[PDB]
Design a protein around this ligand. Structure first.
Ligand SMILES: *[C@@H]1O[C@H](CO)[C@@H](O[C@@H]2O[C@H](CO)[C@@H](O[C@@H]3O[C@H](CO[C@H]4O[C@H](CO)[C@@H](O)[C@H](O)[C@@H]4O[C@@H]4O[C@H](CO)[C@@H](O[C@@H]5O[C@H](CO)[C@H](O)[C@H](O)[C@H]5O)[C@H](O)[C@H]4NC(C)=O)[C@@H](O)[C@H](O[C@H]4O[C@H](CO)[C@@H](O)[C@H](O)[C@@H]4O[C@@H]4O[C@H](CO)[C@@H](O)[C@H](O)[C@H]4NC(C)=O)[C@@H]3O)[C@H](O)[C@H]2NC(C)=O)[C@H](O)[C@H]1NC(C)=O
Ligand SMILES: *[C@@H]1O[C@H](CO)[C@@H](O[C@@H]2O[C@H](CO)[C@@H](O[C@@H]3O[C@H](CO[C@H]4O[C@H](CO)[C@@H](O)[C@H](O)[C@@H]4O[C@@H]4O[C@H](CO)[C@@H](O[C@@H]5O[C@H](CO)[C@H](O)[C@H](O)[C@H]5O)[C@H](O)[C@H]4NC(C)=O)[C@@H](O)[C@H](O[C@H]4O[C@H](CO)[C@@H](O)[C@H](O)[C@@H]4O[C@@H]4O[C@H](CO)[C@@H](O)[C@H](O)[C@H]4NC(C)=O)[C@@H]3O)[C@H](O)[C@H]2NC(C)=O)[C@H](O)[C@H]1NC(C)=O
Lengths: 208, 208
């Protein structure tokens, strides 16, 4: 083995709302016990940066260490396609190990968002399925949530993005509710957040 | 480096259709380039059964070969949860790497199949989307297809299976047709194959 590096990007929600603070997470794994001195170097677009908050190595069950540095990125810096490079140098490795991560290259396409009622055959048991189709968006970074009457609906699952034929992405959100509420006539909302949307937000609803 | 070994299961369609041939495959990546020899014995519930038509070694770009064995398996055996073990006897291995695979354990659940038509929001565009919701099935091994008037429709994408709240699986399949064809009045039908289906096959139909 040896020390291995993993670079995870921010959560799509984090970069689309100036409210949150998107961060890029470099994690060093299997740093050995003998020499566990690990240097972190951070570059944005090749230019070295130093506002990264490296954090105290945590020793693991396997008598192996694991360090994490967190670089907070600027929302527009991520959406303007900057490239974040985590360099990790260690005494137990032939050369420093590099990793770079970015938003997917390409032209952002805007998600179409529709809402699909339950079919009749399903209207036969306790709960039915309200479907939110989101298609035609690029890149795949996206967030989906449901609510109705202002409060969050929680019994819902969202499939991962799928590559469509034209090269954009689609997904579905399925929200499961009691057939009562569906037959009552309550309206439910599928809310989508994506960088190619005005205000990074749209909302589409659905009721009897 | 060294010789990593990966095992893969049959295609779901293959194990449900006596017509088709289901087979397990043992991949061997990053093979020594300065010793390149490999063995395989193959066991079903322990008992060696040897049939591994080792698809004659092949070569990939990066100093690395890729030998591959494939063993036929009985249809009912795989659905009866027997374990297929690939023991890649390699003499340049520190020790013989062993790996096992079996169908998911658990009580099979029958998929429910619902046809959802396009939204009217969607009807503006040159192509609309027909949705086949497939939910409630276990295990996740499943196959979805689209066809029109007995002939295969092919411009469709299917999301992977997703674990739902009750511990079953669901997915969705999207078929894209030019509004012309939908607006006339054609029937499109979504056919699903799953182990808990009568004859491993159902089909629900959709039309204007
Ligand atoms: C000793 O003990 C150690 C501790 O247990 C053990 O450490 C583990 O080593 C593993 C390697 O052997 C390592 O495995 C990798 O895991 C990656 C995913 O891990 C995430 O999800 C896991 C759950 O599945 C968690 O356990 C992880 O901690 C990690 O969780 C994520 O963590 C980040 C950082 O905290 C977090 O991001 C930040 O979240 C905050 C919070 O809100 C903010 O939002 C920030 O904005 C955000 O940055 C995530 O939220 C969090 N996610 C979740 C779900 O919790 C996995 O990706 C790795 O797979 C890649 O590499 C393998 C090769 O090893 C490939 O096979 C695989 O296909 C992947 O390959 C990559 O795939 C990419 C996409 O497909 C592609 O782009 C790349 O090119 C490709 N790279 C390739 C092919 O090289 C891998 O499985 C594991 O994480 C370690 N555990 C921990 C806790 O660190 C160690 O192994 C032990 N040693 C021994 C000898 O036993
Ligand atoms: C030099 O260049 C080499 C050539 O390119 C390169 O080779 C690759 O090395 C990789 C090793 O690092 C290796 O990556 C693995 O990929 C596994 C999945 O691969 C499938 O999909 C890949 C990408 O989509 C394809 O490239 C593969 O070929 C493979 O495709 C499958 O192939 C089989 C056999 O052909 C096929 O089955 C049969 O198919 C036919 C029709 O095709 C019929 O259907 C038959 O009936 C059927 O049996 C499949 O259909 C086909 N599938 C697809 C989708 O096409 C992947 O599984 C590996 O990841 C696991 O291990 C890593 C280890 O790091 C874990 O991190 C990761 O999380 C996965 O771990 C498993 O996860 C499971 C779920 O959570 C869990 O249950 C397991 O326990 C867990 N196991 C663990 C943790 O150990 C891995 O990514 C790749 O296969 C090699 N390429 C080829 C062509 O084999 C080499 O690396 C280069 N070397 C250097 C030094 O640069």
């Amino acid at each position: 083995g040896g020390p291995s590096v993993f670079l995870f990007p921010p959560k799509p929600k984090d970069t689309l709302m100036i409210s949150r603070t998107p961060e890029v997470t470099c994690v060093v794994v299997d740093v050995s016990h003998e020499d566990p001195e690990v240097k972190f170097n951070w570059y944005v677009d090749g230019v070295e940066v130093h506002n990264a908050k490296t954090k105290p190595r945590e020793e693991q069950y396997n008598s192996t260490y694991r360090v994490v540095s967190v670089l907070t990125v600027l929302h527009q810096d991520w959406l303007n396609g900057k490239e974040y490079k985590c360099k990790v140098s260690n005494k137990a490795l032939p050369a420093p190990i590099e990793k770079t991560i970015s938003k997917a290259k390409g032209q952002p396409r805007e998600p179409q968002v529709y809402t699909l009622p339950p079919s009749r055959d399903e209207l036969t048991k306790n709960q039915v399925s309200l479907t939110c189709l989101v298609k035609g968006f690029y890149p795949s970074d996206i967030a989906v949530e449901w609510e109705s009457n202002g409060q969050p609906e929680n019994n819902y699952k969202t499939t991962p993005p799928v590559l469509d034929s034209d090269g954009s992405f689609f997904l579905y959100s399925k929200l499961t509710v009691d057939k009562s509420r569906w037959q009552q006539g309550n309206v439910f909302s599928c809310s989508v957040m994506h960088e190619a949307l005005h205000n990074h937000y749209t909302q589409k609803s659905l009721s009897l």
